[PDB]
Amino acid sequence: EFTYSYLFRMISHEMKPKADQKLEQFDITNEQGHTLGYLYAHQQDGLTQNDIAKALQRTGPTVSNLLRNLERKKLIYRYVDAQDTRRKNIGLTTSGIKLVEAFTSIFDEMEQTLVSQLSEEENEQMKANLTKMLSSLQ
Amino acid sequence: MEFTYSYLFRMISHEMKPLEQFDITNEQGHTLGYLYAHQQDGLTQNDIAKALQRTGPTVSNLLRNLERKKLIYRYKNIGLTTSGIKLVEAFTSIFDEMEQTLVSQLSEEENEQMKANLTKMLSSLQ
């Protein structure tokens, strides 16, 4: 019946308050969380400042600032690319990887409810498939 | 070492954000969509603005227009007109390139399961 975008959008709209707070515990802004998750997704490829500005759909200075705040904590490292000196390449540090896996892995009350509907076989299937969809997307 | 539902939904919803044949503006389509989801609640412009992620006056132009086309009515509390619900059902129901790719990933059964559980899970929150 209803479209995948619509389901994900509605679920996100409802989910966002508790989601916002969970990031608060780790001291990251939600655009920062989106950035780390995106970097985490693309560890193999490499990603650049422009790639991040595109992903976040955000203004350039806003991006440079968010990126600076993350480098201050040494979550990420930024360097000029060898082939093209216009591009600025970005990578995740050890602390950053640790942060991202905790940020993604951890279980709240709300999640506990989300699992509560389903069986363990059912959850293994859904979580796995949902991950396949996410990977396809990027 | 497995992603939470919260993370996956945040990331997918994030990947997703970007029609013309329905003569609406995507942000309008979103407002119609949220109104559709929350009808039992009813809703207010402040509710719509906060939920939308947009300023309160900005919402007013969209509403002004949707009202003109009589796709919504308010009593404030805002509700969908009949043409409004039909349009949202078409607008939501629609196959599209992105949707095509996502359905492509899984079996008819896997897609049914995923869709049903998504509908249940959202049903739990509201």
Side-chain angles (χ1 to χ4, degrees), chain B residues 29 39 72 81 83-84 93 101-102 114:
Chain B
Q39 75 296 120
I72 51 174
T81 76
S83 48
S93 224
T101 45
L102 281 175
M114 168 68 62

Side-chain angles (χ1 to χ4, degrees), chain A residues 3 8 34 104 106 111 117, chain B residues 4-5 10 13-14 99:
Chain A
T3 196
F8 294 130
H34 271 130
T104 296
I106 73 140
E111 178 89 2
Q117 333 304 41
Chain B
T4 48
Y5 282 124
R10 151 196 326 145
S13 227
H14 209 81
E99 229 270 328

Side-chain angles (χ1 to χ4, degrees), chain A residues 2-4 6-8 10-12 15 22-23 34 37 55 103-106 111 117-118 123 126 130-131 133-134 136-138, chain B residues 3-5 7-16 33 36-37 92-94 98-99 102 105-106 111 114-115 117-118 121-122 125:
Chain A
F2 299 163
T3 196
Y4 263 128
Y6 173 75
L7 303 169
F8 294 130
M10 285 324 126
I11 286 194
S12 233
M15 233 171 31
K22 148 153 75 155
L23 276 64
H34 271 130
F103 174 26
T104 296
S105 239
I106 73 140
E111 178 89 2
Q117 333 304 41
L118 251 78
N123 300 262
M126 166 158 240
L130 227 19
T131 308
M133 312 188 26
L134 186 30
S136 104
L137 295 185
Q138 306 308 22
Chain B
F3 300 57
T4 48
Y5 282 124
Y7 183 66
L8 292 151
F9 303 146
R10 151 196 326 145
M11 255 341 285
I12 297 192
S13 227
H14 209 81
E15 228 52 298
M16 233 111 216
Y36 185 38
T92 294
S93 224
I94 207 194
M98 233 228 319
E99 229 270 328
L102 281 175
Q105 249 64 71
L106 324 189
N111 286 333
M114 168 68 62
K115 235 124 189 189
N117 315 10
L118 274 169
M121 275 185 212
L122 170 33
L125 325 195

